[PDB]
Amino acid sequence: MLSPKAATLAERSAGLAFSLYQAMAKDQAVENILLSPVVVASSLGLVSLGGKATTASQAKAVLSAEQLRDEEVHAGLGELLRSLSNVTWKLGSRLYGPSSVSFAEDFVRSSKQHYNCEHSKINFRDKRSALQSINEWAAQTTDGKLPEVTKDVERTDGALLVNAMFFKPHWDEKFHHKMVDNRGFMVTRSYTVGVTMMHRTGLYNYYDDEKEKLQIVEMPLAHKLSSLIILMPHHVEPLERLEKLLTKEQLKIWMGKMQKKAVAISLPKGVVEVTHDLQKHLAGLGLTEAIDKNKADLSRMSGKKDLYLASVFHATAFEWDTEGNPFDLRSPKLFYADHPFIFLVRDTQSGSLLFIGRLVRPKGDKM
Amino acid sequence: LSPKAATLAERSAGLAFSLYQAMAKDQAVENILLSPVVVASSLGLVSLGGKATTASQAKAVLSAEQLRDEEVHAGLGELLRTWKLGSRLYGPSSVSFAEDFVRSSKQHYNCEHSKINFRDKRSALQSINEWAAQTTDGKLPEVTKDVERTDGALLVNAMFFKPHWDEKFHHKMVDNRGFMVTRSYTVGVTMMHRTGLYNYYDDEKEKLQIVEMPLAHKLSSLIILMPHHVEPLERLEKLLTKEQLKIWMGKMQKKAVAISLPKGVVEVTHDLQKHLAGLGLTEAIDKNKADLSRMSGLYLASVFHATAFEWDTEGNPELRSPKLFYADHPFIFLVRDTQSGSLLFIGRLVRPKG
């Protein structure tokens, strides 16, 4: 049960996550999307904690938390971050600064206390060794599930905020370990990728919108504490059309229209690795001073105005596996996920969004 | 297997492509079902029962001119010897078959003989049909609805063939699907489905797929040629030669293929009379020119080649994302002996029953 501070911050983080998803979905250079609302919000919390004046106030504004006290934002976000880990879930946050920088004692202490932030000095001039450190740190944090964050560090002079995550939804009703085979995933009508798919038939909350040509299914996670919801068009098409319909309000309508039905769910099985550099997307949402070398004031992090935010790495290894609770119809409806789909992970009690994303292109070879 | 049989086998199969093509060109013809060995045995019977040009043309259509009569009959006899086959020669009541021919035609061709009166056309059709139904145990209950030539000899071949897969289809992997005869005409059919490792080749340039389906104990194989989408078979038939088949076979590789096929009995009756004359058997067919004096008394009126071909699930009791071989449109098929390469069958399915 979320405290009042954490409940409003959860609702604010979700609003932001929808806005970020929508911004990123407009970007033609974005394929798969994986966003943890609380982790995104905690990035804004660190900028506010390490910033002064407009650099810090814009971070609170992007999170729609400008009318909240700094203490309320740090405590609220701390409580939400801890609620994410209360077995499989793995999170790490690390601030990388150039070797020519020194992090302030007060910021190190409080960023550790509220955000579990780690701090490291890195020689960005030696590109291979810098990538090696970041990817090895990300790899250990996720126990090898996320072995690489980025293939390039384009700028030697700024701060690098890195969030490395591993999430594996645990079904309330597990898929049978042998109900796995090779199928073709249609990325487009003309491009098919060889994938492994897992299959299960059960009683699931379902709704087939014949008007908007889409299907929505709810998959409860272990002990019905959370649920994974999947939105998919009837046939292969780009997600842009469905994304126009995707709002907090339209989701509520769909959820209410859902009913328990026999559904044969077929899903791609494997680890989806996504790394976003949210720096530009957060800038587009109002975080302008923090990313500008000539304007940024991150003097609480480093003692002076030598630092600006170069990148905000939100990196996730999301695993679709058969594993779930050892629990467990004549003519089921098919939910055959062999084409791009949208998914959300929602806490049942609070309604808090753990994840929002989309699978447009899984791993594998072209067939 | 023996030198004579193997040498006669290539000839019977050379005639298979020749006859299939001539029939494929005929616009009245829909489905095709031909047994090359059975067709060849009919030419052997004409050579056995004929004299001079009537018999020399029979050997010529068989490309067996330079072979001794004994080699032809022994070679075909061995080749010929689920599969139900019956061969019977019907002659008018005014005729009498010679003892020597009856003995030899039985020894080489397992040929049967009967006298028939066309005075009652219904009773004559009744005799032929009943004989065919018993030969095939009811699988082929009717041969023809009319006998256009009543003054000559009627060679009648009645057959039942059911390929038994080396890897059976599941008895419940059967459902109702639409078979596209054309882009505008669809017939309700029953289809059987199976996924397994099959020799396969997809010719992206000629827009066709070829699959090899081994029959029980890999003694023979059923090969299916089909275009990518619904289109008349005329285009593929131009490509269908003994040589192009070898190229396709060599280009094939074992792949995961989900094969979907129409399930049911395909009944086809061909009158080979005009087609064999088109291939060179002109004298035997002509009342005024035919010399069948070795049978005694006249001319070859018809050569009925009637077949009930059954596509069933039955057969002998991981894989990558399979390629689909969805046979819901016209296709060509061949049944080939693995050892010899001899053709047991050549045909096409353009319009099933439903």
Partner: peptide, 14 residues
């Protein structure tokens, strides 16, 4: 027993 049929194939090109 065998599973249900798969989903309908994609529409043909224009």
């Amino acid at each position: 027993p065998p599973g249900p049929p798969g989903p309908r194939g994609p529409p043909g090109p224009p």
